[model samples]
Target: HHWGYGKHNGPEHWHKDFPIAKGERQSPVDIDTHTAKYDPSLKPLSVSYDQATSLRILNNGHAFNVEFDDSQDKAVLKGGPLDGTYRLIQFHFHWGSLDGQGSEHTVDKKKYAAELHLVHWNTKYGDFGKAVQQPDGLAVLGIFLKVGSAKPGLQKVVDVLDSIKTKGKSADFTNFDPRGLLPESLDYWTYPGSLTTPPLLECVTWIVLKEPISVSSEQVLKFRKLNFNGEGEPEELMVDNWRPAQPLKNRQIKASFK
Candidate 1:
């Protein structure tokens, strides 16, 4: 059977298939303020996007991803603890069954309702597959989400969720710019870590924003309505799709703001 967020295949069992799951720089670590240092030299993160070219939204059985066109450098995530251009590939979200918890990274032992990940890859490597295997090959911008009044940008994605209600289901989602999803402040904490999901590569440079974007409880419930099971299977609702925070291990956490 394939991997999943169930009792038999959750985070606790990932190490069998992926040895890197227990690697040194495992991610989704607690962003504890006690050790988070402020780096004045760090520059503000730059996210440049071309015209809205979001192709589609897919329920990948784990997390739903809004795919994009990465053939060119039309969209890029540069600057802020970065060396060269990192092209934007896609973006997705992680949430818990309940509103109290879900976000991958935590601050001061706190958990938000959910988290947003803007996944990007270094262009110098020439391809995503190769880039993801390199040390500094990937950059992910993480924004936390706390339950609050509805944010307009969220409605755009939620409105289309019904079309892709089952696993492996994807539908046309275009002219949808991702920038609107971010919170006002770019202030963030930077760390070198691994992917929260399978293949758990230790290649991502995480830039988890200090501020949180909004998504109401009702809206988050809509995502829960999506089934992990595709058509022709027992309908299992997708929930608690988040991994627990890993050990800090010998890494330093740097904050953009003091």
Candidate 2:
């Protein structure tokens, strides 16, 4: 019942342990922009991040998560299809063994080099863990990654990769604003979907940006050096750690831009 990126225990077999893996509101959907309905009513996104809230970074087997101190609304996201303020708890990324097929959500059947998920929980729910179980509990901002010129904001993150190269490794990470990773345009597509990982809870309001951020080919390779296994165990390359796109059933994709 262990979940890993392999032929036996990868996304293809997640349904055996998590029945919700095949749920109606599953995540990582292919976004056909031509068919997405434009919503003039969708408000512009308001994102405010505090670098002091940045705490530590961890290699959580599947991905590298940069955690934040969410005890207060130090980093908050509001507007853009949200009813209230949502506190940023952490952010992580997903990538593939190669450059072309990493991002979970695709645009017009085209995948990106990677994807980033900045997870936030609704303040109305009190806390992240509690809010995760409620329908309006979570909000995940998805940013697609394309290979090109180096991103200075991302270089700070990539610089720390060596410290947490193996599963279970963690290091103090502070004074960094996660909002620096975002693209200039806040235009996005909104949908109701679930977590792409285990437990796969259907509580997320996904706000996927229309614009992709840039990263260098060398920076992308740094992610591959991370190991899925801990120091004492057999080293397994942590790549292709993305879930496949699921069916968009009985749902409409709303775009925030023309």
Candidate 3:
């Protein structure tokens, strides 16, 4: 009914609700590795997590997300592209109907099967509302998902999909370590960008990993099984839930490693 990845209510029509969609510094850009400059000042990204930080897994009519108990710093992302500490709020994904083209941010104009976004809000802003209002308010750790061998790290998430097949459905999920989802290296590209979703807030410090985590092709198909419709409100599959790449404008993509 609202914004979705359909011919009628997709990214192109999002501007009607979010004027900032066309504004400068929009997100999900194509990262040209050659254009990225190596910034020596950039420190290795610190991704600290506590398995207990996990709260629940849900189908938010958009994507299945694992919520975190961010009341404390048990799980946080800082050091790279972030000025202050950012607390992990939730982690979700954007995927295609199938493999090969689902990731939001592409490298060298390349696409992955899907993308994982670990959303965090800056603690300096006091609360989520205030945090999203500032330019330095949020930090989103973007990781690309490549189709390959089975990744046990990802299977942990997929294992719970059976419990939430419809929109607005959630199940108890905890003691899960999100760090296991990361690639061996923390090397990444940094940039100033906005949220890929509507309200398209331009307050995120995008830290996209250079190396991608691998998963099986069958796993991606399972995500497509999730429905955009809640309960029995017609069946609409939630696929291609990613926004197209926006203009880079006058921004620079900095590499954490030379």
lDDT of 1 by residue, 19-68 (tens): 99999999999988878999999999988875547898999999899999
Q: What C-alpha lDDT does candidate 2 achieve relative to the native structure?
A: 0.93
CA lDDT, candidate 3, residue 59 = 94
Would you list the clashing residue pairs of candidate 1? none
**Whole-model lDDT values for every prediction:** 0.90, 0.93, 0.90
Error of 3 at 181 (Å): 0.5
Sort by TM-score, best first: what order? 2, 1, 3
Instruction: For residue 100, give model 1's deviation from the true position in Å.
Output: 0.2
- Please give each candidate's TM-score: 0.98, 0.98, 0.97
Candidate 2: deviation at residue 198, Å? Answer: 0.7
lDDT of 3 by residue, 1-258 (tens): 698889999999999988999999899899998889999999989888854379899998888989999887778887976788899999999999878789999998899999999999999988778998999999999999998898888888987898899999999998888878889999999999998998899999999998999899788888988898899798998899999898999999999887
Query: After TM-score superposition, what is the CA distance of residue 196 in candidate 3 from its true location, in Å?
Result: 0.7
Superior by lDDT: candidate 1 or candidate 2? 2
Give candidate 2 regions above 4 Å deviation: none
